């Protein structure tokens, strides 16, 4: 039951975040004024990890530096960090092959794709996995699933329709749809290979992706054997179902509580909002995980760190978090928005449902609505932004600018409009 | 009983035939006269209705 190793699939979903991920690594970016890797690490610790393995390729030096700086580098940690360095750009099959070549895989190894933070206890899950394994010899891997918000409507990228059994908790079919976004395929598929064996058929769609996998020693060998499987969800699970190796079982764990992985931008925002509220049961910033953090709890879901300065007569709405070393002026209307560490806010600024990253200067008499500002990117005087406007690294938005709905701004100093240099594109300036 | 929309009885007490001030009464009604008044009002309303569709149709005053 004890002694379990962890392999984390990092630097995999780059260019999916279309403006960012070009200069700095994907996972190093802060969720709520603190890096995304830390949460994942915490989760792993909670689960039960004895050795840490990270897959790095895109900007690996920075990752290494971070690791060196991190708390787990010191000898007090039960798990040590040793990174896998591989050639640039490869699929999860190739990575698996590489891992196999090296050879550290023992027993029930943990494989996590992307970064996930959830509240559910893992020991029970592990126990369940063990018991099910003890049933039959040819058991493969565990999948995590959670109940969705009644009806699906905000899910377009990965709205997977899971046909499931109640007695064994096993997947029957996996399919992706663009149905709510584009009315071309509003569609359902069922295969007849497992009809006269299961009987209890339950057709469901409202289940959210987690992508946390508890895997046996068979999986890397399987990957080595069948080199056609580049992905792990679309081709692999389906293959397993359609009897690639005959007489084999897979898991689909069902939980009533919240569990969602990071995937896009709106989804990320939603996750952040959830974190801000009391959705996750023990996951709160006021506990202080990074040790340098000095967060404290206040009334009406408001987070305040130490050395946070806010001026008199500023009406605040609901759910606000402020990072350390902030100076905010007078006459501000703040509603459902997070302000980063050491940010300098001017005077008379109306904010609604927005997001502000680490060290950003917001200019006087500006309106920000449902838009994101990345690290070290500054807003000037009189800037009016609409819903879902992503701003990249070090973008200097100077005096007087207006940007419409869903305008993406580049991060590296290419194809998308508005650049890192002085003034965003209303008058042509840049490289 | 009265409030909004419902038909209610009137008789002209005092008229200022110079600028526009009209005095109206409900209790003065000559007994059953109320019913007659109501009928008259209804008739007037019907007449108005009659000369509304034609005004909109032929586009004339």
């Amino acid at each position: 039951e004890d002694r379990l190793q962890a392999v984390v699939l990092t630097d995999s979903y780059e260019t999916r975040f279309m403006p960012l991920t070009a200069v700095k690594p994907r996972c190093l970016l802060p969720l709520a004024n603190v890096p995304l890797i830390e949460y994942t690490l915490e989760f792993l610790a909670k689960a039960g990890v004895h050795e840490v393995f990270l897959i790095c390729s895109s900007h690996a030096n920075q990752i290494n530096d971070y690791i060196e700086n991190s708390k787990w580098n010191l000898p007090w940690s039960p798990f040590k960090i040793t990174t896998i360095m591989s050639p640039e750009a490869r699929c999860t099959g190739d990575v698996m092959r590489d891992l196999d070549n090296r050879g550290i895989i023992t027993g029930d190894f943990i494989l996590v794709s992307g970064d996930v933070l959830t509240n559910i206890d893992f020991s029970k899950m592990l126990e369940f996995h063990k018991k099910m394994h003890l049933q039959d010899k040819d058991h493969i891997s565990t999948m995590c699933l959670s109940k969705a918000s009644t009806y699906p409507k905000t899910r377009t990228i990965e709205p997977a329709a899971f046909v499931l059994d109640k007695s064994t908790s096993r997947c029957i079919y996996y399919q992706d749809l663009p149905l709510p976004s584009s009315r071309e395929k509003t569609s359902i598929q069922i295969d007849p290979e497992l009809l006269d064996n299961v009987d209890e058929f339950v057709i469901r769609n409202d289940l959210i992706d987690c992508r946390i996998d508890i895997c046996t020693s068979h999986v890397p060998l399987i990957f080595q054997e069948n080199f056609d499987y580049q992905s792990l969800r679309t081709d692999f699970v389906k293959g397993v179902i359609s009897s690639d190796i005959l007489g084999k079982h897979i898991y689909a764990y069902l939980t009533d509580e919240y569990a969602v992985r990071v995937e896009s931008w709106q989804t990320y925002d939603t996750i952040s909002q959830d974190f801000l509220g009391r959705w996750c049961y023990p996951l709160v910033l006021d506990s202080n995980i990074q040790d340098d953090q000095t967060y404290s709890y206040e009334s009406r879901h408001i987070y305040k760190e130490k050395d946070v300065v806010l001026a008199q007569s500023c009406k605040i709405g609901k759910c606000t978090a402020i990072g350390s070393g902030t100076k905010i002026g007078e006459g501000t209307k703040i509603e459902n928005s997070v302000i980063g560490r050491n940010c300098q806010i001017g005077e008379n600024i109306r904010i609604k449902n927005s997001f502000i990253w680490d060290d950003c200067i917001i200019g006087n008499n500006s309106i920000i609505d449902h838009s994101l500002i990345a690290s070290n990117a500054t807003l000037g005087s009189n800037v009016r932004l609409n819903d879902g406007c992503i701003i990249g690294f070090n973008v200097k938005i100077d005096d007087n600018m207006d940007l419409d709905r869903n305008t993406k701004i580049s991060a590296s100093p290419q194809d998308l409009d508005d650049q890192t240099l002085a003034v965003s594109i209303v008058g042509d300036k840049g490289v | 009983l009265i409030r909004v929309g419902k038909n209610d009885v009137a008789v002209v007490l005092r008229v200022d035939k110079e600028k526009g001030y009209i005095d109206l009464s409900k209790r003065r009604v000559s007994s059953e006269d109320i019913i007659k008044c109501e009928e008259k009002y209804q008739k007037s309303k019907t007449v108005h209705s009659i000369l509304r569709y034609c005004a909109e149709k032929f586009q004339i005053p």
Partner: protein
């Protein structure tokens, strides 16, 4: 002060932190026990040479622990007590090393005016004493506790989460000559299951049990005789932190009707630090337990809290293992257990 000095000498600190953060450890008593164990480990293993330096180190450790978890008061308290125990011994030693008059046990003017031994064993003994104290509280309460409740009187019970309060009730109920009717308030988002359990226990004990919803407190208040709190932490001026949900309103009601409000906890739960802010010490619960769905629940921001704070004006009695005390007197008890400099770390 970082954890650079303690890595191979003491390792359990990290484990303690883990227990605190993800709530693997439950019940204040257990936390206290853990703290005691940690202290013992520190004592048995580490090296000192000097005494003041050691004291400073201990203080630093305490501070670190506090920083790791603020809602664990018992942990802090125990440490403070240990420090106090050390301090007196140190003071005694100094007098022999050098080789005084006082009106009472402690003097105010001594602060204004200018003022190797086997202390380790004494320190060790202190821990044991503390453990012993923790072990039995109910035995030192029941001699005072089963004197207040009378025949044909009605009790009202907010917070059934505490293990001591139930025991106290049971001891009273044991007596054949005494008969009382029990009204139990539920506490919806945090106390419900616990309340139910308490009710079941009462039923088992063969007493008249009345399960009352949180709304039906007002109608029965003309018959209510006494009020008992299931508090978790005691403080300086009198104010107390209660073991989750449905305490404040009931207390207010009692105050309005001039119903006597009792409190049973213990001196290990008693803290020498002041509760200056309600927002700082009181921790909030979870939104997920109240209402299903997530997408419409972004609009529906729900407010729910674990712990509850009650002002010292409503509560009048604090019966502990030593005896019956008041909110106007309990400060002195704390002083008798924790010294003057040991308050700030």
């Amino acid at each position: 002060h970082p954890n650079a000095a303690t890595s191979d000498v003491n390792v359990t600190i990290d484990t303690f932190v883990a227990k605190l953060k993800r709530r693997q450890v439950q019940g204040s008593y257990a936390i206290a026990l853990e703290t005691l164990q940690l202290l013992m480990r520190f004592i048995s293993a580490a090296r000192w040479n000097h005494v003041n330096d050691l004291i400073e180190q201990i203080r630093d450790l305490g501070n670190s622990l506090e920083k790791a978890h603020p809602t664990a008061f018992s942990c802090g308290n125990v440490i403070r007590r240990i420090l106090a125990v050390l301090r007196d011994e140190v003071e005694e030693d100094t007098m022999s090393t050098t080789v005084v008059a006082e009106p009472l046990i402690s003097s105010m003017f001594n602060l204004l005016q200018k003022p190797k031994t086997d202390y380790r064993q004494v320190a060790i003994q202190g821990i044991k004493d503390l453990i012993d104290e923790i072990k039995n509280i109910d035995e030192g309460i029941q001699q005072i506790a089963i004197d207040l409740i009378h025949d044909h009187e009605i009790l009202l019970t907010p917070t059934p989460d505490s293990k001591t309060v139930l025991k106290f009730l049971i001891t009273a109920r044991e007596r054949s000559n005494r008969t009382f009717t029990v009204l139990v308030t539920e506490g919806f988002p945090n106390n419900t299951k616990n309340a139910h359990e308490f009710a079941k226990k009462l039923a088992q004990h063969n007493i008249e049990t009345l399960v009352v919803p949180d709304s039906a407190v007002f109608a029965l208040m003309s018959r209510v005789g006494k009020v008992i709190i299931g508090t978790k932490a005691v403080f300086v001026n009198g104010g107390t932190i209660s073991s989750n949900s449905g305490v404040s309103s009931v207390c207010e009601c009692a105050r309005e009707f001039r119903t006597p409000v009792f409190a049973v906890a213990g001196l290990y739960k008693l803290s020498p630090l002041y509760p200056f802010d309600v927002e700082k010490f009181v921790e909030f619960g979870g939104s997920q337990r109240i209402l299903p769905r997530m997408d419409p629940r972004k609009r529906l921001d729900t407010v729910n809290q674990i712990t509850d704070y009650v002002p010292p004006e409503n509560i009048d009695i604090y019966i502990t293992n030593v005896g019956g005390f008041n909110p106007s007197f309990i400060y002195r008890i704390a002083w008798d257990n924790y010294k003057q400099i040991d308050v700030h770390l």
